[PDB]
Design a binder for this molecule. Structure first.
Ligand SMILES: CCCCCCCCCCCCCCCCCC(=O)OC[C@H](COP(=O)([O-])OCC(O)COP(=O)([O-])OC[C@@H](COC(=O)CCCCCCCCCCCCCCCCC)OC(=O)CCCCCCCCCCCCCCCCC)OC(=O)CCCCCCCCCCCCCCCCC
Ligand code: BCL
Ligand code: BCL
Ligand SMILES: CC[C@H]1c2cc3[nH]c4c(c3C)C(=O)[C@H](C(=O)OC)c4c3nc(cc4[nH]c(cc(n2)[C@@H]1C)c(C(C)=O)c4C)[C@@H](C)[C@@H]3CCC(=O)OC/C=C(\C)CCC[C@H](C)CCC[C@H](C)CCCC(C)C
Ligand SMILES: CC[C@H]1c2cc3[nH]c4c(c3C)C(=O)[C@H](C(=O)OC)c4c3nc(cc4[nH]c(cc(n2)[C@@H]1C)c(C(C)=O)c4C)[C@@H](C)[C@@H]3CCC(=O)OC/C=C(\C)CCC[C@H](C)CCC[C@H](C)CCCC(C)C
Ligand SMILES: COC(C)(C)C(=O)/C=C/C(C)=C/C=C/C(C)=C/C=C/C(C)=C/C=C/C=C(C)/C=C/C=C(\C)CC/C=C(/C)CCC=C(C)C
Ligand SMILES: COC(C)(C)C(=O)/C=C/C(C)=C/C=C/C(C)=C/C=C/C(C)=C/C=C/C=C(C)/C=C/C=C(\C)CC/C=C(\C)CCC=C(C)C
Ligand SMILES: COC(C)(C)C(=O)/C=C/C(C)=C/C=C/C(C)=C/C=C/C(C)=C/C=C/C=C(C)/C=C/C=C(\C)CC/C=C(\C)CCC=C(C)C
Ligand SMILES: COC(C)(C)C(=O)/C=C/C(C)=C/C=C/C(C)=C/C=C/C(C)=C/C=C/C=C(C)/C=C/C=C(\C)CC/C=C(\C)CCC=C(C)C
Ligand SMILES: COC(C)(C)C(=O)/C=C/C(C)=C/C=C/C(C)=C/C=C/C(C)=C\C=C\C=C(C)\C=C\C=C(\C)CC/C=C(\C)CCC=C(C)C
Ligand SMILES: COC(C)(C)C(=O)\C=C/C(C)=C/C=C/C(C)=C/C=C/C(C)=C/C=C\C=C(C)\C=C\C=C(\C)CC/C=C(/C)CCC=C(C)C
Ligand SMILES: [Fe+3]
Lengths: 325, 256, 274, 51, 52, 51, 40, 51, 51, 43, 51, 51, 51, 43
């Protein structure tokens, strides 16, 4: 069949691209160490180029390791320094938040005290990385959309572990640092406060989460469909619209009655992704601090469905009938 | 706070309606930002359409193009408009397909239609043209996959229309863009470019299925063999895609 | 109406079936043979929903609920108001979705572009198909499909999730969820790069592909490129749709116990000391 | 032993000093954390237990 | 390529062989599959690099 | 209710397999013996029998 | 890119020779299986 | 029966590989179904014959 | 006796690698099949014979 | 005649070695099967 | 006899790596198979032998 | 004897790195399987002794 | 003997950092293994001795 | 002849040193295994 531009069928490698520069002198803090991976080059660019290491980057990397190490050292000490048991229970162990009896006060180190310290380094690490994104955009003389989009993700990150626990008056409302435990927290959070499905902002966040994957499947497929017209070079299609932007627009205009531009697609792309944690952060912030039960909130506001059929299994079958005896 | 402002309208309900107002404003903002190109609507006859849509045109935004290419305000007269199109209306009304008046691939209409872009090469950060042949590119070479240079080129009908003499690369992104085809004298005269996205590279040959053997002699050429302008780029790429419908009557006619 | 550049693209041909009998445009929409069937199936399905809503007693969009039949009916047809209307709407919905995907094939064939979008939509159709017919077929009853309600179909997700005692422990759910949170990650950053490059601070020149290529090189040490992000981007979202289809088709037809119990293979491996 | 000064020919003093400093602090913090996790060498708990 | 894919194909075949081999000597399908997946990634990855 | 998703999936092979201890109890149980008027009790027949 | 008349003449002869050799063992195997354990 | 004209329209590389895979897959399938049956399973039958 | 022409069709490098992979996989598969059976399992037979 | 570049005489020489290798592999396989049949017959 | 011509087809560097990987994995797998059995597990026999 | 020619094929630096990683991982694995067994776990044997 | 030739093959900068991380990770791992055992946990033994 | 661009004389020099290291590594292992067998025999 026709070549679907999914994997590049021939790779060319030249001198490593060290990056652009201006009076801000980016090259001072760049590593100047490049490597080329032909495996990742099949789907994307093959150069593992140099990384700009500043002070926001180093502080974020160092403090993030401290949070990673403090969590890891606790988890290792939780199983009595048994490496085989630490690996076996790696997905089950965590650094549990403080007990609710301590409120917002500093708890003992074994009862969430190390959680606050590890959370303190994680908070510094995440904010420092955001500052790096803001500083890099300013030093690259581009817009701060990367930093602004990151701040939306941090908004849910801050609400989950910093803002809501403060508003709820207890550090116990934070999310445990575990693979399965933050899944258990996710399930327990929904159960504790009614049914988080009936949270309108959780529903709203799902709309933009579904829309984000829906759009970025649509945008990815549309660009790859028009990549035969140089559609992957979107920036040149913004300053000088080619047939790639015209056919991409006309495909969606003829399909659903309206379309976007090569630049306006990313505004839809940016805002749907950004609205996913923004609505989620609001929904989590309103959970417990305001509502404490969402299904009853749905019943009160008359959007919880009502069922007339019976509930027991005896109303539909028999135990012997199900067993086939 | 667990108190309702009125009836059952609490802080959670207030935030929901605040987002409804913001989203309605955002939808209006997003849709107008999508209308910087292509509007006013116009109709089949070319006159401005009576209907223009619920959303008004946005205020002009200005792009400061690099490499001394001037400014750019998207809401306005479109320099990419094509004139003297070789089409005729199949109906006196609106909403009906146009019938090409000649060779659709030669005239550049439909799937073969291009856009009147700038007649200058795309430039990278340094300033020199972005897409250059590997012969001109310094330090570049094949690192993975099959090298298409020297392999014969097979058309959509199985004809061998020449062999790949060189391939053009985007040295800024280290990506292959085109393949030069040294057209055989029985089929063509000189060198033609084919985009990498419409050619499938096999072990012993490169196959392009959109264009038959007899259509390579009419592929648009480049003014210079060292660079390709955005206009030549748009004409070359559109020609191959136009062959997906215009190579033979079977492709244009319904498959069932 | 048209666009400022639409006229040169509205050419005859590119249909899969029906030729020029349906080959015309109604407004901006393209009407094909599958645009005719889309109109029939979508309108019939939508009307039957409101017909079922009328007899249900409420027209509230939140409270509208067209539920599948009982599990006792098996794979056979049920009375139209005992779950049979859901079966017809499902047939109309499947016919509308397939026609919509096939209509997109005609549109992108007429524009001489790739068929990536109809293929990507087919994954979304497959995710719906595996939810409404494939999984009910494997489980032996049409009552296992989700109901057609804005909030009623959330109760089905909640009950089906807790039908395996903790649905987060589903290994395919973990893979599928990881793709959603990353697809939105890729969408946020990819949309940010193009916007940041095309909209620099006021009074400064716009940037080219190199500036965004070197930004995440300076940011995260690697940039996948302008073309690569759309290639990985389609794959990330398609895998999100595919693995979501997998996580629900193995919940009940392939796995009946709790999903935490699935991870017992890892816990009691012979290598782990007692 | 007396000729160990040649290690600075192999190693860049700038990056090794940074690596040594980060490792030395992480070692010091880790060992203190290990001591705090024990029931006998938690000097904070012993102070409370002694009063 | 024509060699990395073959090495990848060799690894997945060995992963299936290790999957059924563990089932025969006891274990379980899921436990055996993980080692087969591990064998496919390790042996396939090592071969894809060691021999080219 | 139909459409709520409230159902319990079970493999028919698992359903067709009863509790393995069902037949064990059936092989060990027996019908009770109806006592007659003034029948002998275990307290007097045997010794050290709990009341 | 296609075979000549002479090329397919020897190819078919080899293929038939392999056909008879493969079938001859199969016929012998089936007879041995039938004697050992008939299915009719 | 000559029937050598068929080979003119066939690529020997493609048909031989396809036929070679097909024969082994067919042979394996017949061997697998025989093992599935309790009568022609020579592995189970050999155990019964010895015992 | 004319079978040597098969090498004119198939590249020896491709078939030899495929044959080697297939031969070991087939040999391992048959060995594992025997180990599954209770009769032709020489590991368990030695345990039974010794006891 | 050829498809992979080997000449007619080259394939004849290659086939002779391959058959000799095939017979050697089959010879030990026959011996291996014969010994197993004596140890534990399956017929 | 004249098996030395296999090196004209197989690259000695390619086959040597593949053979080395194959031999160790085969040796490791067989060793692990013996440990799985309860009769040839030399580690568990020593515990039983030592009483 | 004549094995020295293996270095005309294998890259000495590419094999020494592979040998170093393989040898340690092999040594670690055997030390791990010894600790898995109750008879050869020298840490547990020391605990049992003098206690 | 004459093992000094290893530095003709191995880069001294790359091996020294490679063994530096390996030595500490090995030393940390073995220390943790001791801490996982009741007998060799010097931290828990000080508590027992003091009591 | 030489896929690594390494001379025959160099290879013999490299192997002689490598074998000397191999025997030294094996000599320690023999002593190590002898000590383990005395402490805790596995046969
Ligand atoms: C034969 C039919 C066969 C199918 C029938 C069965 C279908 C059943 C469901 C039908 C749902 C509606 C489908 C669209 C109706 C037809 C639209 C149409 O013909 O043109 C409209 C007509 C234009 O006429 P035209 O023929 O297109 O001429 C060209 C224009 O003049 C040129 O002007 P333009 O260039 O500016 O573009 C015009 C464009 C202008 O419009 C736009 O620009 C759209 C941009 C905004 C849409 C993107 C935002 C949505 C994403 C998030 C949504 C989730 C949010 C959740 C809540 C978040 C918090 C609030 O108009 C459109 O075509 C947009 C149509 C799609 C609108 C959105 C579709 C629904 C999405 C929301 C779901 C709501 C549930 C519906 C279920 C109803 C079941 C009874 O007038 C309008 O534009 C009004 C818009 C219609 C809105 C109705 C939406 C229903 C609610
Ligand atoms: C039983 C389970 C409950 C449930 C309980 C919750 C809870 C609880 C929450 C959600 C939330 C979310 N739910 Mg819900 N949810 C359920 C059912 C669903 C279903 C479904 C089909 O059934 C879906 C699709 C969703 C979907 C979603 C998303 C819309 C939303 C998360 C937003 C976001 O992007 O997060 C992504 C954001 C983050 C991951 C945090 C930001 C991370 C920071 C910025 C990154 C730091 C990185 C860190 C330093 C590590 C770096 C390491 C690197 C290697 C270097 N839920 C049911 C009802 N749901 C969230 C919400 O409410 O949003 C309003 C939330 O808190
Ligand atoms: C108790 C609840 C359990 C749970 C139980 C379930 C169940 C049950 C399911 C999921 C499924 C999903 N869950 Mg879960 N899951 C939970 C928690 C979560 C969380 C979280 C943060 O906590 C997240 C992110 C997710 C995420 C997800 C995704 C893996 C998936 C969502 C559906 C899908 O992909 O789309 C796929 C759906 C489609 C693509 C729709 C196709 C659309 C059609 C083709 C077009 C529609 C057109 C229509 C007519 C509109 C047109 C009208 C207008 C004209 C426009 N789950 C909790 C723990 N989860 C669902 C799934 O996988 O489905 C496959 C599933 O069934
Ligand atoms: C790769 C997987 C992702 C994906 C991709 C995807 N979806 C797509 C496409 C692509 C690539 C399109 O090209 C196509 C499109 O044009 O979108 C604008 C589309 C599309 N997917 C859509 C939405 C959508 N995508 C979703 C998700 C996803 N689709 C995934 C995240 C969801 C979810 C998660 O639920 C929804 C709701 C539509 C906007 C569009 C399909 C339009 C269509 O089918 O039109 C024909 C039909 C009608 C106009 C109405 C039919 C009505 C029926 C007859 C009756 C009702 C049936 C239905 C079951 C109702 C149930 C209601 C309750 C559940 C509330
Ligand atoms: C809401 C929409 C999506 C989103 C958006 C989003 N996330 C973002 C951004 C955006 C727009 C960024 O710009 C930013 C970024 O830089 O992305 C590349 C980011 C980001 N969000 C991330 C991930 C992420 N996104 C998530 C989700 C999402 N965020 C959605 C998919 C989630 C989930 C599901 O919660 C996560 C976990 C990060 C990859 C990145 C920024 C995080 C970051 O770098 O924080 C600083 C921390 C470190 C540098 C170190 C962390 C810890 C290390 C693992 C420790 C070191 C280990 C190592 C072994 C060393 C050991 C040493 C010792 C042995 C001594
Ligand atoms: C009454 O009491 C009685 C009964 C008496 C009693 O007490 C009984 C006690 C008894 C019997 C003692 C039983 C214990 C025994 C026996 C102890 C085992 C002893 C051991 C295990 C020996 C360790 C030495 C191993 C080393 C130290 C290797 C060093 C390895 C080197 C470092 C090589 C690696 C380095 C390289 C460079 C190679 C890599 C090469 C390239 C990368 C090219
Ligand atoms: C439970 O399921 C049950 C019920 C069982 C079931 O499904 C029933 C099964 C059913 C219905 C399937 C029916 C099977 C059928 C119909 C299969 C026919 C079988 C055939 C056709 C056998 C081909 C043999 C080909 C060889 C072996 C050639 C050998 C020749 C080789 C290839 C050498 C040729 C090469 C050269 C000469 C050199 C090249 C020459 C030149 C270069 C010149
Ligand atoms: C579950 O069900 C059960 C019942 C279990 C089941 O499946 C039953 C099993 C089933 C159905 C499998 C069917 C078996 C088949 C089909 C057997 C294929 C096996 C074959 C065909 C054996 C080839 C041997 C080839 C060698 C070993 C050559 C050696 C080559 C040597 C090394 C020489 C190489 C060197 C040169 C040539 C030199 C090059 C020359 C020059 C350069 C001149
Ligand atoms: C129950 O069973 C389980 C556990 C499951 C199991 O899997 C069983 C384990 C199984 C089956 C593994 C099978 C083990 C095998 C096969 C052991 C391989 C081990 C080998 C081969 C030993 C190499 C030693 C080489 C050295 C250490 C050389 C030293 C090199 C020296 C240092 C020289 C370096 C060079 C120079 C100094 C300069 C040279 C350069 C110039 C002269 C220029
Ligand atoms: C006293 O009591 C006694 C009597 C003992 C008793 O109990 C009764 C027992 C009795 C009677 C035994 C019954 C015998 C049985 C059940 C044995 C079945 C076995 C049979 C029938 C034959 C197998 C032979 C298989 C080969 C050896 C095939 C050779 C095929 C090879 C592998 C070539 C295939 C490959 C190609 C042609 C390559 C083509 C290439 C391309 C296409 C590219
Ligand atoms: C091999 O190396 C060694 C080292 C041995 C090792 O083990 C390596 C480490 C290993 C394996 C640990 C693996 C870590 C794992 C699995 C952790 C997963 C983590 C997960 C799922 C995160 C959940 C989400 C949590 C939120 C949402 C937080 C948000 C809270 C933020 C931070 C807000 C700030 C909070 C505060 C309280 C502020 C405190 C400040 C002051 C009070 C000033
Ligand atoms: Fe894009």
């Amino acid at each position: 069949p026709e070549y679907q531009n999914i994997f590049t069928q021939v790779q060319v490698q030249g001198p490593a691209e060290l990056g652009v520069d201006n009076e801000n002198n980016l090259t001072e803090e760049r590593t100047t160490g490049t490597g080329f991976s032909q495996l990742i080059g099949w789907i994307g660019n093959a150069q593992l180029g140099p990384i700009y290491l500043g002070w926001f980057g180093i502080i974020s990397l160092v403090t993030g390791t401290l949070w990673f190490n403090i969590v890891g050292f606790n988890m290792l000490s939780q199983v009595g320094y048994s490496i085989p048991e630490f690996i076996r229970q790696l997905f089950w162990l965590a650094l549990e938040p403080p007990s609710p009896e301590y409120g917002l006060r500093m708890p003992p180190l074994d009862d969430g005290g190390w959680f606050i310290i590890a959370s303190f380094f994680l908070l510094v690490s995440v904010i420092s990385w955001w500052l790096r994104s803001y500083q890099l955009a300013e030093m690259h003389k581009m817009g701060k959309h990367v930093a602004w989009a990151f701040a939306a993700a941090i908004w849910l990150f801050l609400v989950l572990g910093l803002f809501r626990p403060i508003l709820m008056g207890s550090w116990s409302e934070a999310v445990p640092y575990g693979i399965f435990p933050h899944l258990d927290w996710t399930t327990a959070f929904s159960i504790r406060y009614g049914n988080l499905y009936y949270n309108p902002f959780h529903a709203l966040s799902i709309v933009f989460l579904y829309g984000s994957v829906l759009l970025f499947a649509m945008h990815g497929a549309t660009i790859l469909a028009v990549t035969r017209f140089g559609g992957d070079r979107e920036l040149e299609q913004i300053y000088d619209r080619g047939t790639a932007s015209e056919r991409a627009g006309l495909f969606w205009r003829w399909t659903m009655g309206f379309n976007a531009t090569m630049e306006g697609i990313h505004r839809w792309a940016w805002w749907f992704a950004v609205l996913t944690p923004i609505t989620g952060g609001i929904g989590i912030l309103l959970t417990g601090t305001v509502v404490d039960n969402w299904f009853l909130w749905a019943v009160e506001h008359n959007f919880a469905p009502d069922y007339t059929q019976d509930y027991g299994y005896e109303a539909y079958t028999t135990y012997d009938g199900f067993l086939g005896r | 706070m667990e108190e309702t402002f009125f009836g059952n309208f609490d802080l959670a309900s207030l935030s929901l309606w605040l987002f409804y107002g913001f989203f309605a404003l955002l939808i209006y903002y997003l849709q107008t930002e999508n209308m910087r190109e292509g509007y006013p609507l116009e109709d089949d006859d070319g006159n401005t359409a009576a209907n223009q849509g619920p959303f008004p045109l946005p205020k002009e935004k200005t792009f400061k193009l690099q490499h001394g290419r001037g400014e750019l305000t998207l809401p306005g007269e479109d320099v990419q408009r094509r004139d003297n199109l070789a089409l005729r209306k199949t109906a006196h009304g609106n909403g009906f397909p146009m019938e090409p008046t000649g060779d659709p691939m030669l005239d550049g209409v439909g799937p073969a239609s291009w856009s009147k872009r700038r007649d200058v090469p795309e430039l990278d950060a340094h300033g020199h043209p972005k897409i250059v042949p590997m012969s001109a590119a310094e330090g570049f070479g094949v690192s993975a996959g099959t090298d298409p240079r020297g392999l014969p080129v097979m058309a959509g009908d199985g004809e061998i229309v020449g062999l790949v003499s060189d391939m053009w690369i985007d040295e800024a992104e280290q990506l292959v863009r085109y393949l030069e085809i040294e057209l055989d004298p029985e089929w063509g005269d000189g060198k033609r470019l084919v985009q990498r996205e419409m050619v499938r590279i096999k072990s012993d040959r490169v196959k392009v299925r959109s264009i038959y053997g007899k259509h390579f002699k009419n592929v648009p050429k480049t003014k210079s063999p060292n660079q390709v302008t955005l206009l030549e780029e748009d004409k070359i790429m559109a020609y191959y895609a136009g062959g997906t419908l215009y190579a033979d009557e079977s492709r244009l006619e319904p498959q069932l | 109406a048209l666009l400022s550049f639409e006229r040169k693209y509205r050419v005859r041909g590119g249909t899969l079936i029906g030729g020029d009998l349906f080959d015309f445009w109604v407004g901006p929409f393209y009407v094909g043979f599958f645009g005719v069937t889309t109109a029939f199936f979508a309108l019939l399905g939508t009307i039957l929903i409101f017909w079922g809503a009328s007899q249900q007693g409420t027209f509230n969009p939140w409270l509208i609920n067209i539920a599948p039949p009982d599990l006792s009916y098996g794979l056979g047809m049920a009375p139209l108001m005992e779950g049979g209307l859901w079966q017809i709407i499902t047939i109309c919905a499947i016919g509308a979705f397939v026609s919509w995907a096939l209509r997109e094939v005609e549109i992108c064939r007429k524009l001489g572009m790739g068929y990536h979008v109809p293929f990507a939509f087919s994954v979304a159709i497959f995710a719906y198909v595996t939810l409404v017919v494939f999984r009910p077929l494997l489980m032996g009853a049409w009552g296992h499909g989700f109901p057609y309600g804005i909030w009623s179909h959330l109760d089905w997700v909640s009950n089906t999730g807790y039908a395996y005692l903790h649905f987060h422990y589903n290994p395919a759910h973990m893979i599928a969820v990881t793709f959603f949170f990353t697809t939105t990650l890729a969408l946020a950053l990819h949309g940010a790069l193009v916007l940041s490059a095309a909209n620099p601070p006021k009074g400064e020149e716009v940037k080219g592909p190199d500036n965004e290529d070197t930004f995440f090189r300076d940011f995260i040490g690697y940039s996948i490129g302008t073309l690569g992000i759309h290639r990985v981007g389609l794959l990330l979202a398609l895998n999100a749709g595919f693995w979501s289809a997998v996580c629900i088709i193995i919940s009940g037809p392939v796995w009946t116990k709790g999903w935490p119990e699935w991870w017992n293979w890892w816990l009691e491996m012979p290598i782990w000391p007692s | 032993m007396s000729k160990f000064y040649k290690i600075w020919l192999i190693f860049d003093p700038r990056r090794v000093f940074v690596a040594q400093g980060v490792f030395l602090f992480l070692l010091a913090a880790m060992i203190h954390l290990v001591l705090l996790s024990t029931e006998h060498f938690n000097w904070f708990e012993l102070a409370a237990a002694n009063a | 390529m024509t060699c990395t894919i073959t090495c990848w194909g060799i690894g997945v075949l060995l992963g299936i062989m290790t999957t059924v081999g563990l089932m025969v000597v006891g274990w379980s399908f899921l436990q055996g599959a993980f080692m087969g997946v591990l064998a496919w990634l390790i042996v396939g990855g090592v071969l894809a690099v060691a021999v080219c | 209710p139909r459409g709520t998703g409230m159902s319990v999936p079970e493999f028919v092979s698992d359903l067709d397999t009863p509790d393995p201890t069902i037949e064990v109890f059936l092989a060990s149980t027996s019908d009770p013996v109806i006592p007659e008027e003034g029948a002998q009790t275990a307290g007097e027949a045997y010794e050290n029998v709990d009341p | 890119t296609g075979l000549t008349d002479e090329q397919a003449q020897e190819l078919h002869s080899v293929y038939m020779s392999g056909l008879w050799l493969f079938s001859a063992v199969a016929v012998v195997a089936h007879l041995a299986t039938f004697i050992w354990r008939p299915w009719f």
